[PDB]
Write a protein that binds this ligand. Structure first.
Ligand SMILES: [Mg+2]
Ligand SMILES: [Mg+2]
Ligand SMILES: [Mg+2]
Ligand SMILES: [Mg+2]
Ligand SMILES: [Mg+2]
Ligand SMILES: [Mg+2]
Ligand SMILES: [Mg+2]
Ligand SMILES: [Mg+2]
Ligand SMILES: [Mg+2]
Ligand SMILES: [Mg+2]
Ligand SMILES: [Mg+2]
Lengths: 200, 122, 198, 32, 210
RNA sequence: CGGCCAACUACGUGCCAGCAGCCGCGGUAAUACGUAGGGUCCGAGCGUUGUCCGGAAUUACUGGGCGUAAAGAGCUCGUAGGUGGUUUGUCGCGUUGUUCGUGAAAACUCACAGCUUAACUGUGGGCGUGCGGGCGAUACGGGCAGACUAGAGUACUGCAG
RNA sequence: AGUAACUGACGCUGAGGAGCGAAAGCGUGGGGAGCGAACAGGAUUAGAUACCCUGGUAGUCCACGCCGUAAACGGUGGGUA
RNA sequence: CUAAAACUCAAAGGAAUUGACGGGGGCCCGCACAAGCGGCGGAGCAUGUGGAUUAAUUCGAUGCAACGCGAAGAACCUUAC
């Protein structure tokens, strides 16, 4: 299932901006609902769960998928937090959203689900597609000569392209060199709390 | 302590401590109902709990409590007994599921929606 | 605990140095019987320490929660405690035994995360440990668990310290992996120092 | 410790001995 | 809470003064009636503005009121909109004129009644009553020609159900000593749950005052 | 949607009707019952029932005690057993190192590859905690052949009861 | 304890088992002063089948035998540096 | 002596700390006990209260610490029945 409710509600409830570009969050920093001014008791478990909820609502991933990603991270030899962040950022939806071909995570997910890309010359309609090293993400002409893709490729001035992603020209052929790292991702929220929570 | 004693005899489990006499571990069972009456809880809580003696098909006789507000079952009815726990009732370790074979759901219920056999209103 | 993040119209409100990571374990009401009626009190179990590893526990006693918390903070600041560390983890596995609290602590690799009970996790987060393991085996309490953690930390010893005590140089006491971890931690500390000074 | 458990054991043993004194004749008639 | 007698009510003719100093044969009734009427009329206004004492004296068929305001500017706004308005209200409610004359206090923190009004307003403003009392005690002990203070906020503190009476004191507050010149303040605060009592004592100094 | 444990506003029920896993909540002003909304968890699944484990160090060999929480037999002799002072030679049953065969296929995991991703599947290893044969080692546990007194028992002279 | 001579590991514990084992009680034949279970009465109490008083059968004693029970408490097993 | 099962309880237990108490102790006070004076309780009057009537006997205080208390003023009024 895919989330359909308002994202600003969750952003205000958690206290951090999940979509990045939004004014409702900064206009109403208090949690939504009839009780947004009540003092909430500080709880380690509460903060640990809020971190995971922020990550989930920002990356657009289900709970079972997040649990599987955490399990794979813990199974990997590296560190749990960085491995989880890497396996979550390696998704095709977030990759194409950070490459500049999409404005919002929801739009990137919708586009990658509608089948508007060509991974190594093969079609794909799964946002959970985990890219690998030296992978190429192309775009078909039908989805290239359209309006949304043109606007997304001409408005490439929101954020700079990271070190592990690159645009090889006007074709918007996304190229990846290696897997992302902590310094290359630079996620606002940390991962130690989420790891300690999932390691209960 | 005394590894020799441990090798000789000792270090055994205490007991299995069977929770309920489920008769081969049957979560939900049925049977005949009789004497649908009311019982009084302990002194810390004064009320009237509607209970009934149920003779299950496993050749056993227990006392089951009907959860909810209005019970529809009566003498010689088909109910679905399950394993429960009622602290206020001393000696009751079984409950009845509403809306399984002959019981009817509670009226004006739109919050629980899972227990008491509450259906979805249109 | 309430109405603390205010802005008074006075000169100073309490802004100073010593921004240690203060953490409360638990607060319970204590009653005393007298000739007519009962008198209530508040006991606070505070832990104050710097992110470097210097920790200190306190036990404040008053008739108000803020006063008890302040007394505990002052007691912790007065009675400090030093703890050895290798980068971000404990030195060696230990098992501290308080009156009834038996807290066993074990090291862990970077990126694992601290795991312990309430008071144990509180004191460890207040300390400079981030990736270790700990378990309190019984006594179902908080003050005893804190004292057991303090005893476990006291039972620790630095590598160079134990080497000088046994009369041997380096590379003859610490394993190769532990020595490499210590060298990496020292390099990281030197890099932090030079990047903060320059 | 206290004497609560000791008093309980004493009462139980006294009741058991009273029951035995009452049923002595019947037990003897059955075991003769 | 306790059976301690009001120091002002006890020394009304020894150390403290009287708020109503007049005499009349068969007219004292109407005099005190007009006094309490003026008091009830000015209650809300002078409470929102800050009031310490209202000394009313009676003259040859006229009145002489002296109100001790703490924050001048709220009750005395534009000349002809607030002060004259309340004056005309009092005049049309009573059967005579009113030559209202306000007198400003020297220090709001030195007056017991003003401290009680302030602490009650703070408590009603949804703040910590403990911190409010502490700051009030600090303000009243910041050398306002004082030597002791004792503040108490009884009733349903913190909107709870138990009648908690926090006994807070500082300095020297003797009640059995006559040569005290202690000022007292009794206030009743209204909340969304019920009523609250505020009892204040300010021991200024050991002045005889004979 | 009271604390365990992520989340509150109002109306009606005020020892009643009910809620509930433990603490346990209502006797007119229930964040603990029904109803209206608001918040939280999940999402084609959500809560409940029955079963096994962790927490419970709650059969403690790794991981407890036996004076006052459960516990030294009322005290002695003794069978089988457990165990045992120093030291020389010897066998090497235990132990240790090495090597050959097995420990099937299958399963878990590391790496790669395919079904659009994943579930799923195939390939090269670890594992398959052990076992069967040969050789090496002798400090230690074990057996045999020796020696000695600090333990053990007896001898002679006194001693309290 | 002293001499320290003698064999030189024969040292310690001990599942079952065997022995001893406070008081109380039973059989046999005696004795029984005092005390003293039960039993009778006197006295208080609303009620005393008890605490108090007056007589007293078994018991307390001897030899042959039995059950193995005590707060058998140092509530703490034996042995070793 | 060997020795359980069903059922039940959310405890049962150990140490110490502060109040209450001992017909426990030790150190001391109050017309408190002892000696004296004047009484209540015995009869009439005055009310208040309990209890019963009642068209209403408005309402309460339930010892010490309520009961010549609220009545420091009851034909209408007071009075709320
Ligand atoms: Mg013994
Ligand atoms: Mg040997
Ligand atoms: Mg295999
Ligand atoms: Mg034996
Ligand atoms: Mg005898
Ligand atoms: Mg005899
Ligand atoms: Mg006698
Ligand atoms: Mg009389
Ligand atoms: Mg009353
Ligand atoms: Mg009187
Ligand atoms: Mg009339």
């Amino acid at each position: 299932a895919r989330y359909t409710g308002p994202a600003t509600r969750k952003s205000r409830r958690l206290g951090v901006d999940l979509v990045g570009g939004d004014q409702s969050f900064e206009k109403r920093p208090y949690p939504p609902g009839q009780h947004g001014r009540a003092r909430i008791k500080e709880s380690e478990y509460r903060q640990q769960l809020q971190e995971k909820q922020k990550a989930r609502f920002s990356y657009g991933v289900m709970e079972k998928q997040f649990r599987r990603y955490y399990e794979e991270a813990n199974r990997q030899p590296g560190k749990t937090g960085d491995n989880l962040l890497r396996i979550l950022e390696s998704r095709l939806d977030n990759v194409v959203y950070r490459a500049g071909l999409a404005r919002t995570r929801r739009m990137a997910r919708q586009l990658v689900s509608h089948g508007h890309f060509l991974v190594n010359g093969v079609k794909v309609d799964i946002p959970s597609y985990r890219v690998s090293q030296y992978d190429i993400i192309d775009v078909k002409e039908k989805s290239l000569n359209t309006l949304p893709f043109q606007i997304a490729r001409e408005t490439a001035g929101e954020r700079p392209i990271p070190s592990w992603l690159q645009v090889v020209g006007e074709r918007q052929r996304i190229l990846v060199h290696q897997l992302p790292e902590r310094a290359q991702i630079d996620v606002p929220l940390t991962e130690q709390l989420i790891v300690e929570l999932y390691s209960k | 302590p005394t590894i020799q004693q441990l090798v000789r005899k000792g270090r055994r489990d205490k007991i299995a401590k069977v929770k309920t006499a489920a008769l081969k571990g049957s979560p939900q069972r049925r049977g005949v109902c009789t004497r649908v009456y009311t019982t009084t809880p302990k002194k810390p809580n004064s009320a009237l709990r509607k209970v009934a003696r149920v003779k299950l098909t496993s050749q056993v006789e227990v006392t089951a409590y009907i959860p909810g507000e209005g019970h529809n079952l009566q003498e010689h009815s088909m109910v679905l007994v399950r394993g429960g726990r009622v602290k206020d009732l001393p000696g009751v370790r079984y409950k009845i599921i509403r809306g399984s074979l002959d019981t009817q759901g509670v009226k004006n219920r739109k919050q629980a929606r899972s227990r008491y056999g509450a259906k979805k209103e249109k | 605990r309430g109405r603390r993040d205010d802005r008074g119209g006075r000169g100073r409100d309490g802004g100073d140095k010593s921004n240690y990571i203060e953490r409360v374990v638990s607060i319970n009401r204590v009653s005393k019987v007298v000739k007519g009626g009962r008198r209530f009190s508040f006991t606070a179990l505070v832990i104050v320490g710097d992110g470097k590893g210097m920790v200190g526990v306190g036990y404040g006693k008053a008739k108000e929660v803020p006063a008890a918390i302040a007394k505990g903070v002052e007691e912790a600041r007065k009675n400090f405690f030093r703890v050895p560390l290798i980068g971000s983890t404990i030195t060696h596995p230990v098992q501290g035994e308080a009156a009834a609290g038996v807290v066993m602590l074990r090291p862990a690799s970077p990126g694992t995360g601290v795991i312990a009970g309430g008071a144990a996790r509180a004191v460890l987060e207040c300390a400079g440990v981030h990736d270790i393991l700990a378990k309190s085996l019984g006594s179902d309490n908080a003050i005893n668990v804190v004292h057991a953690t303090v005893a476990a930390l006291k039972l620790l010893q630095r590598p160079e310290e134990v080497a000088a005590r046994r009369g041997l140089p380096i590379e003859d006491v610490a394993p190769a992996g532990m020595l490499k971890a210590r060298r990496e931690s020292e390099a990281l500390a030197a890099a932090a120092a030079r990047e903060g000074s320059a | 410790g206290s004497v609560i458990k000791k008093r309980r054991k004493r009462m139980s043993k006294k009741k058991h001995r009273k029951l035995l004194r009452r049923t002595r004749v019947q037990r003897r008639k059955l075991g003769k | 809470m306790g059976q301690k007698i009001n120091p002002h009510g006890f020394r009304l003719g020894i150390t403290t003064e009287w708020k109503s100093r007049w005499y009349a044969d068969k007219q004292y009734k109407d005099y005190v009636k007009e006094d309490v009427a003026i008091r009830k009329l000015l209650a809300t206004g002078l409470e929102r503005a800050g009031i310490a004492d209202v000394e009313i004296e009676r003259t040859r068929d006229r009145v002489r009121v002296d109100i001790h305001t703490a924050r001048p500017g709220i009750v005395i706004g534009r000349r002809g909109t607030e002060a004259d308005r309340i004056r005309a209200d009092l005049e049309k409610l009573t059967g005579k004129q009113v030559q209202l004359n306000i007198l400003e206090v020297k220090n709001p923190e030195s007056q017991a009644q003003l401290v009680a009004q302030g602490v009650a307003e703070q408590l009603s403003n949804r703040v910590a009553f403990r911190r409010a009392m502490r700051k009030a005690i600090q303000s009243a002990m910041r050398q306002p020609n004082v030597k002791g203070i004792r503040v108490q906020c009884s009733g349903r503190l913190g909107g709870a159900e138990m009648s908690r009476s926090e006994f807070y004191r500082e300095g020297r507050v003797p009640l059995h000593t006559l040569r005290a010149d202690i000022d007292y303040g009794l206030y009743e605060a209204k909340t969304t749950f019920g009523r609250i009592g505020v009892k204040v004592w300010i021991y200024k100094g050991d002045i005889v005052g004979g």
